[PDB]
Every structure is written in structure tokens, then in C-alpha cells.
Write a structure and sequence with these properties.
part of a larger assembly, 6 chains, A mainly beta, B mainly beta, C mainly beta, A: mainly beta, Jelly Rolls, 5-stranded antiparallel β-sheet, 4-stranded antiparallel β-sheet, 29% strand, C: mainly beta, 3-stranded antiparallel β-sheet, virus, HAV, Receptor recognition, VP1, VP2
């Protein structure tokens, strides 16, 4: 070893990612006519736990009959999943919600359902995301959205209040400007701007407030005459192909998965 | 230095579906050997899956009568369900296995005297007849029993079903339904025998079997 | 880990590898019989004696040895190409099943042991999967299964 | 024979699919100047029933004068055919209808008209379908639709009632979200997700409830102010080129074909 | 002159053991064809004679105790007669066939704790033990279960018998007798478990089967 | 195995008939000048019970001095009893 360490025992890697494909394919019989040498093992030894388990005689299970592989991550999580929903009760107000991978946050403020589940599977997340917002109710409403990286000045999150900032500071971060008459939906990629290597989803206390926040999407609406009906927004996150997932963790216990 | 031999402790034995993991184990002791007989006590073919499970069986025995009207159903059969029975030697294969996929071959036999006249259609209907027309039975695999021409029909059909295999203990729905309709009525003069006997012979083709199981029912 | 991934998918097929690990001393002795009884999961299996269960595919492990674990690989036995996540639905429906069978564990030989060693042996049961195929995403929070 | 079966008689296949093309073409006279050897036959014998029927002298009937072949299935049934229609009477309600090939179901709940006819022609159906929904009446109504495979939790079918499920469970199955102001129609392919080989249309009793259901399309609408007029939906099914039809059955009697 | 075709009247069909002689017969009507699955619903090996009939079975389960004297017979087994039973999946093959010739393989399993001591001889005895010496059991195919060394013995033996096959319904005399004798007594200190469990696993090798038959018993 | 049986252990025949002739013959020393590796064994194991037993040094015991072999069956029982 480089560090100066020695040993007689053979050092062997444990829990290698992606051993097999999650679709049935051929790449005769699997096991048979020999013996189940693979049916007795010592699970404590990492050299002997990589022994291909085989017990009875079996056949190769053909090919799976659909094309795509649904156990890939960039497919499964490619489908955009629910994040939040909120409603403006008055004109000329702003609303700011973070994208916070932390699990200490319990919904409605936090990640719900599958996102809360997925970002706790692994330790580190690095890369861009795709975000889609969907608008309901009132029409003829212009609105602006802008993405604020962490550490930079931003209004109190998860709170609906009148803007504290300049139109100049807002537009500098980049902004879409939409009208709920014409579009009724938006889909926009969020950049990865961080002074951090990645953003971990499972953390506590001090490190939880900084390292776990991806960034804060804000939405401001003007020209909302409340003689009209309600104005509802909803947000759905998906994962690009430039995101990367590192170092699998243990999945959440059934009491920690909430829903909205 | 010399090495003195010793027992090999850990070994794994077994046969078909079963397995034995022993810490203390030891080599097996054969005697004799398999012999072939110069003079065969039984010359018939030694039994196997294909001799027992696939042979012909008498499923149903009915009678086609002059008082059956047109489109009367002479015999309605759930074919596979009748093949699963204590009487038939296919049972001992099916009783211990959970799932099976297989073909079916039907032979239906009447015996009209040439002084009678009439017809029959015998069709293999997957699932149930449901609704659709009786006139149109010729769509299904079938054969037409005609008192003038043939007294024997034969039918061969693959496995048609919505799943992988037909679970015998708790069957979802019958795979095949055999229906015998009066295609044109039976007619006689005076004194001619007033009926015909009708019998059905069914068997499996290309029988596969899965899921050994202790469940007795 | 297997239950937490497979809870998010409608349909699952594959081989499930049960890893049994006894925690004996070197001075215990005994044998277990792990029987696989192919069927749905609502079949009533509690009347099956030991001699009847050797019909089904089974394996017998010895308690005290140099190897702790016996890996019981259940072949895929089904009448449908897939099974289904039914725990989302409320009551049971014949024909729609999650499990491919039940796995019975007997006491093949009794447990013998001296006076000064523990009179019982706890046995962990692990779970994993090989040749796995799942698809049709959904969302479900899988509840604890009590026997 | 492999199964061990023997016979002297020649075993000959019966009712082979697609003997001829359903368009008039050439691929002189058809029959003539020889004899009508084909005009006497024994219809009971499957070897003699495949004898090409010919009786009188006849000529080859030229070419058909349009390009397409209307007796193909992937053309005829490609045209999308009526399925159902329904109307929301109140806001924030959900409606769930299955695609059930069973004929025990009598419309308005079930397949009507041609679909009820077509799916009873053959025993097995395996593959994706294309579905188009068309919206009538009220405008400025956002709505979400999601496809639920069989066996999974779903609300009572053919019934209009308030949602029993989470927005998180809904969006996980995948969902469109539309607004009846902008589109007024949708066309979307339904995947084939089944633990079954196929889905049969003619079945009774127990097997009828499971094997005959393709899947349940649901529709939820919000922001429907009933001061407005009625909101009508309608659904039309068509068949992709990846669907497959097996083992022809006998067509339905004239008393079993209903209409809507 | 031209020839107009006609039905071929007389034909002979059948499968395995069965035969059909028909005067009026007619050609058989196939549909479809045997298909192979691209995706296997059941990956285990399809059942056959060798999967069902030849697997291991739990014959007898006894206990070897400290109060059994020397040469005590721990378990006396008629091996084949116990393999013929409703419990064991070999039955469905044997119940419908009259005669069978076959091998036998025994696996006997004890579980002594290292604080016990004793021995066993497990021998395959054709017919009956009759008279001859208990000391001499090592002549027969056997194995010696020793609490110190091995807890597993295995034995493999051909078909030894005075006739062609063993008729199961009315068996002449038992082909094999398995006898388990206390070869040296079981001894313990204070507190050690006072027994050992003993189990027997038997199966057929090279099983042949003859004489299909309706006789249910 | 033909019957479908498998195992890691080596299956070895037990109690083979007619290992040796019942008359003294040669077919030097028998055992010696090496070791009695054959004097320790596990009699329970049929692979190890076929180990030729040898304990001390010994010599080959010449030839037997009559022609016939009285331990044959077709000789011994040939005498009418």
C-alpha cells in the first residue's frame, strides 16, 4: 500500500455499484449438473460474499419484452416528480422556496414523496436539474421567476411576502417572465452554481443548513386582480443526464417517508 | 515430510430439487453397479412423462338423441378440468406440480347407423363461449361429424391462455371448452335405433410441468 | 434495501436470494430445513408436516461448522411473467399476487448442546435479489409485514 | 410426433390466418377450359376443405383502383373509435374509467359499438394503444390524467367522486396536465404494463374481473367554476402498430352488439 | 381422365399405449403450432421422471437416546414401502405403474454435540435381516456414524431381488431393510442433552416403471 | 450422475468382492524403511478404509506349497455336503 500499510490478507472491494442490468437479457442453463458450491458461504468475509449465489438448477430467463430499462436512474428519475404547491392570495407578492435535499425538513416545507425518498438513497449529488412549474386558476397574470444560488441574499423562504429587493437585483440573476394567459406551464433547467463540491441530503445541525440547499427558486407575480379566482402554482423536479449520484446510503425507514 | 490423509469435512450433495449442506460429511459408499438385463422381464417401453401424462383418456361419454333440437348442446366439456382427476394416470404428474403449459388433442367418436342422418360440430373454444354466434363455430378449430361420411373427428390445438401456465389447484378460468352442438338434427325412420353414443378422448401434447409442491389440494 | 427499491414499482420479477445466518457456538448442533412452497401468498401452508414438505424444493443446513451462511436462491416459479405490487390496493383479489410462494422453516433435527451454553440459536434472515427486473414506476410506502 | 403420437392420416392445419389480401390485384383466366374439379368436395375433411373453390369460368378481376387496403386491421382499427363520454357536475372531482375488453360489461359502462365488436373477434390482445380525449364546454379548466395498471390502487371505476389519493401517488404513475383553454384535445399512447401475457376479451365470472382489464385511465379537474356551462369529455381508442391479435374467435351475435 | 379426391376411410391413430382403429376416419385438423417463449415464466427445470420420482424424501425420523443399550435398533425401516405413500411425489409415478426396478440412495443424519459420545452403524439389508450376526453388519453396504467424526452417512445400492421388479400393490417381500443399531452406547456428562435426533433421506436412482394400470389399490 | 444427483464428495465403491487370492503367493519387503502411514486411519470414511493396512516391517511370505486354492468357492463347495 502507498500509505505504508501491509497485510497478508487480500483486500477486496465491497458493494461495487451496478453489478447487473435491471432488465432481463442474455449476455443452456445458469446453474446445474455440477453442484451448489455457491449455496454455502461465510457472509462475514467480503471475499466470500461476492460468490455468485446458486442453489438449484435453473434456466436462463430469456429476454425482457420491452425495450427500455426501468431500473436505470436517468430513466426512472427522469420522470418529473412532485415538489410543492402554493397559492397567491394577493397582488404584487413574492414567494421563495428552496430546493433542500435535507430530510430534517418535513413537508409541506421540504421534499415530499419520491424526491424525499430518492435524495436519501445516496450521500452526494452534483449537477444541474430540470424544473417545471404549472399554473392554475387566474389568467392574464404576468410573473417573473429567478434562481438564486446559496449564500446570496434572498427573501425568507417558504413565505409569501412583498418583495424586499430591487427589480435590478432580481433580473441580474437571470429571470424568465411569463404570462399565465399564454403559457400555463414552464420547463426550465436549473444551473449548478455552488461553492461546494456536492450537496448532501442526509445531514444534521450546522452542516444541514448550508450543504443541503441546492438553490432557491423564487416567483413574483404582478397584475393579479383578486376579484378573479385562485392562482395556484406547482413544481415538479426531474434529473438531467449531467447529474451524478455518489456513495449509496441506506434507504429511509417507513416512518420517515411522508407525502403531500 | 509426508502427508497423512484425512476426511474432507464440508461438502454439498443433493438431487433434482433438494440440497444438503454438511459440515461433518464423508464420502459416499457405492456397492455393485447398474446392470443391463440380457433378458427383459417387461418388453414394453419404460414409463416416463410422455408415456403416462400424454396418453389418451376417456373424458366424457354422452348420447346424441332424436329429441335434441338444432343447436342443442350434446356435450359441454371443460377439457383440462376433467383431465385432472383420480381416475386418469396424468393426475400423478399434475397433482404434485403447480403450473403446466401444454397442448391438447381431442378425438370425438359417434356411431350412427347408415339408416340415421344428422350432423355435429365439435369445436375447441378457449375460455368460455361467451356470446358470439353459434352459426360461426367453424371459426374455432373444429370438425364436422356427419352420419354419412365420418364418425371420427380429431383436433390438435396449442396452449392459448392469458398467462404463463394453468394453475390446477385454484384454476383462474378454464383454458379450453369443448362444445358439441347438433348441427343438423338426427332423423330416423321406423325402428331404427333412436340415438347414437358419443365419447370423447383427450390428451396433452408437449406437456411441461413446474412447481413441485406438498399441497395436497 | 430490496424492499425499499421494490416498493416503488408496480411489477417485479427475478430470483430472490435468502441469506440465512445462524449465530451458534461451536458446541451447538442441529439442522434446519428451508422449504419453498410455490403458490400465491394466501395459500394456507400451516398444516404441512415435515415429510410432506420434502416434496417441495428444499435445502438443509447444519448449525455448527466453519461456514455460517446458507444462501437459498428461489428460482422464478410463476404462471405470469411478472408479479404485481398489490399492497397499494385495499382488499385481496384472486389471480393478483405479489409473492411467488411461501418459504417455510422447520426444525429438521433438534438442537442439542451442553449445560453451560445458550439453549437456543438466533438466526438472521437476509434478503437480496439477482436477475431482477422491475418496471412501471409508482409511489408506495411499504408497511411492516407481521406474520 | 414429439409427444409420441402416431397415425396414418396426414395432419393438416386448419383456418390459417391471412390467406389472401383484401384488395383486388394480380399476383388470362382464373378457372376455365378444364373442369370444375373444385366444385365437389367433402367439407368435413380438413385436407379437402382447402381445395380452391371454383365452379364456372371466370376472369382475373383487374387491379383495385385505390392504393390502400381497407381490410387490414392496422388500417381499419387505426381510425380511432368511440369509447365513452362523461360530464363533471362539480369542481375538484375525479373520474376513473377502465379499459375493459370484457363483453359481460354492458355500455354506458363498457366498450360500445365497434370496439365491443372488434375485441370480441379474437381471443388475445397484447400491446400498447393510442388514446385521445376531447373536451367540450367550459374553458379555463386545468386537469390532470394518469394511467393506472391493473392490480394497483385506484378509485372506484365508472364513478365521479372526490379524490381518495395523494397528489404524490397520482403524479408517480406519470400524468399529463392540460388546460381546456389552450388545447381542447389530447392524444396520448397508453403503455402495456401487465403481469399477464395478454388480456382476453371473452371471459366469465372470476377470470373476467382480472384478465380482461387493460388499465384504468383517470381524469381529475380543478378550477371548475360551475357558474359556467357543462364540461364534457369523450374518449376514442385506436390501435398502434405494436399491438398483436391472436387466435380468431367467432364474432358477436346481433343481439350482443350495443351502441352509445 | 382426371381423378377427383376423396376421404381416406381406414386409418389407425393413437399415442403411447392406446390405439384407435376407425373405418370412417378423416384427417386431423391442427391449428397454430408449438411456440417457444422468449421470456420464461418458470425458470426451473421442467418436471419429468427424473425430477419428480428420483428426488430425496424424508422417510423416517427417530431419536437415539442414552437409554438405548448396545445393538439396540434405533430405527427399523422398510425403505421402499415408505417411499410408496401419498406424501411423497414419487407416488404419482408409482401409483399408476405395476412394476419397477430401481436403485436406492440413503442419507442418514444425526446431530451429536461434541460433549456426547457414541456410534451407529446404518446398513442396507436386502430382504430381511433373518438371523445372521449383528457384529457382522459391516458386510452389508453401510456407514459408521461417529459422534466424533461424521454426522452424515451416504449409501448407494443397486436393485437386489429375486425377481424382475418390485410389484407395489401386492409386494412379495421388502426389497431393502434399513437397520440402525447402537454400535457403541451414547454417553453424556451432567447437563448435556440426553439424546440426538436422527433422520433418513431416501430416493430412487435409475428408476424404471412398467405396467400402467387402473387398479387404484 | 445419470439420476440427476450431484455432490462434491468422491463416491467410492465399498466391499469389492475378491480383493485377494486365498493362497500365499507373489504377484524384498512388503512394508518397511518408510513409515506406517497405513497405521492411522478413519474407518468411518469408505475412501480411507481401502488404505492398505500396514504397521511394522514385514517380508513377502514366499509361495504356498500346495497347488490348489482351498478358499475358492467352486473348490470348497465342490465337495459334496
Amino acid at each position: 500500500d502507498d500509505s505504508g500499510g501491509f497485510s497478508t490478507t487480500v483486500s477486496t472491494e465491497q458493494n461495487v455499484p451496478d453489478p447487473q442490468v435491471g432488465i432481463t437479457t442474455m449476455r443452456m442453463d445458469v446453474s446445474g449438473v455440477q453442484a451448489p458450491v455457491g449455496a454455502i458461504t461465510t457472509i462475514e468475509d467480503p471475499v466470500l460474499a461476492k460468490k455468485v449465489p446458486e442453489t438449484f438448477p435453473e434456466l436462463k430467463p430469456g429476454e425482457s419484452r420491452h425495450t427500455s430499462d426501468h431500473m436505470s436512474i436517468y430513466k426512472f428519475m427522469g420522470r418529473s416528480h412532485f415538489l410543492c404547491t402554493f397559492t397567491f392570495n394577493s397582488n404584487n407578492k413574492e414567494y421563495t422556496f428552496p430546493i433542500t435535499l435535507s430530510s430534517t425538513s418535513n413537508p409541506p416545507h421540504g421534499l415530499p414523496s419520491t424526491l424525499r425518498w430518492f435524495f436519501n438513497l445516496f450521500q452526494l449529488y452534483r449537477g444541474p436539474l430540470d424544473l417545471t412549474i404549472i399554473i392554475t386558476g387566474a389568467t392574464d397574470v404576468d410573473g417573473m421567476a429567478w434562481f438564486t444560488p446559496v449564500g446570496l441574499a434572498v427573501d425568507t423562504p417558504w413565505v409569501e411576502k412583498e418583495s424586499a429587493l430591487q427589480i435590478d437585483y432580481k433580473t441580474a440573476l437571470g429571470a424568465v417572465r411569463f404570462n399565465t394567459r399564454r403559457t400555463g406551464n414552464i420547463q426550465i433547467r436549473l444551473p449548478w452554481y455552488s461553492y461546494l463540491y456536492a450537496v448532501s441530503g442526509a445531514l444534521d445541525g450546522l452542516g444541514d443548513k448550508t450543504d443541503s440547499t441546492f438553490g432557491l427558486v423564487s416567483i413574483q407575480i404582478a397584475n393579479y386582480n383578486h376579484s378573479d379566482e385562485y392562482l395556484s402554482f406547482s413544481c415538479y423536479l426531474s434529473v438531467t443526464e449531467q447529474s451524478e449520484f455518489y456513495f449509496p446510503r441506506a434507504p429511509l425507514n417507513s416512518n420517515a417517508m411522508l407525502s403531500t | 515430510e509426508q502427508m497423512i490423509q484425512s476426511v474432507d469435512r464440508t461438502a454439498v450433495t443433493g438431487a433434482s430439487y433438494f440440497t444438503s449442506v454438511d459440515q461433518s460429511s464423508v464420502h459416499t459408499a457405492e456397492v455393485g453397479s447398474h446392470q443391463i438385463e440380457p433378458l427383459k422381464t417387461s418388453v414394453d417401453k419404460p414409463g416416463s412423462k410422455k408415456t403416462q401424462g400424454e396418453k389418451f383418456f376417456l373424458i366424457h361419454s354422452a348420447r346424441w338423441l332424436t329429441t335434441h333440437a338444432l343447436f342443442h348442446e350434446v356435450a359441454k366439456l371443460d377439457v383440462v378440468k376433467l383431465l385432472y382427476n383420480e381416475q386418469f394416470a396424468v393426475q400423478g404428474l399434475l397433482r404434485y406440480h403447480t403450473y403446466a403449459r401444454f397442448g391438447i388433442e381431442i378425438q370425438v367418436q359417434i356411431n350412427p347407423t347408415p339408416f340415421q342422418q344428422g350432423g355435429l360440430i365439435c369445436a375447441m373454444v378457449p375460455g368460455d363461449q361467451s356470446y358470439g354466434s353459434i352459426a360461426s363455430l367453424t371459426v374455432y378449430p373444429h370438425g364436422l361429424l356427419n352420419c354419412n361420411i365420418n364418425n371420427v373427428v380429431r383436433i390438435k390445438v396449442p396452449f392459448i391462455y392469458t398467462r404463463g401456465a394453468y394453475h390446477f389447484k385454484d384454476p383462474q378460468y378454464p383454458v379450453w371448452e369443448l362444445t358439441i352442438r347438433v348441427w343438423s338434427e338426427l332423423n330416423i325412420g321406423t325402428g331404427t335405433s333412436a340415438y347414437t353414443s358419443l365419447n370423447v378422448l383427450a390428451r396433452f401434447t408437449d406437456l411441461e410441468l413446474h412447481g413441485l409442491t406438498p399441497l395436497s389440494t | 434495501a430490496l424492499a425499499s427499491i421494490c416498493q416503488m414499482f408496480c411489477f417485479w420479477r427475478g430470483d430472490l436470494v435468502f441469506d440465512f445466518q445462524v449465530f451458534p457456538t461451536k458446541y451447538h448442533s442441529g439442522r434446519l430445513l428451508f422449504c419453498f412452497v410455490p403458490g400465491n401468498e394466501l395459500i394456507d401452508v400451516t398444516g404441512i408436516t415435515l415429510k410432506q414438505a420434502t416434496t417441495a424444493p428444499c435445502a438443509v443446513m447444519d448449525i455448527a461448522g466453519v461456514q455460517s451462511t446458507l444462501r437459498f436462491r428461489v428460482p422464478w416459479i410463476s404462471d405470469t411473467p411478472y408479479r404485481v405490487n398489490r399492497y397499494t390496493k385495499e382488499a385481496h383479489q384472486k389471480g393478483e399476487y405479489t409473492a411467488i410462494g411461501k418459504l417455510i422453516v422447520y426444525c429438521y433435527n433438534r438442537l442439542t448442546s451442553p449445560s453451560n451454553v445458550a439453549h437456543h440459536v438466533r438466526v438472521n434472515v437476509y434478503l437480496s435479489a439477482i436477475n431482477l427486473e422491475c418496471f412501471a414506476p409508482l409511489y408506495h410506502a411499504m408497511d411492516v409485514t407481521t406474520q
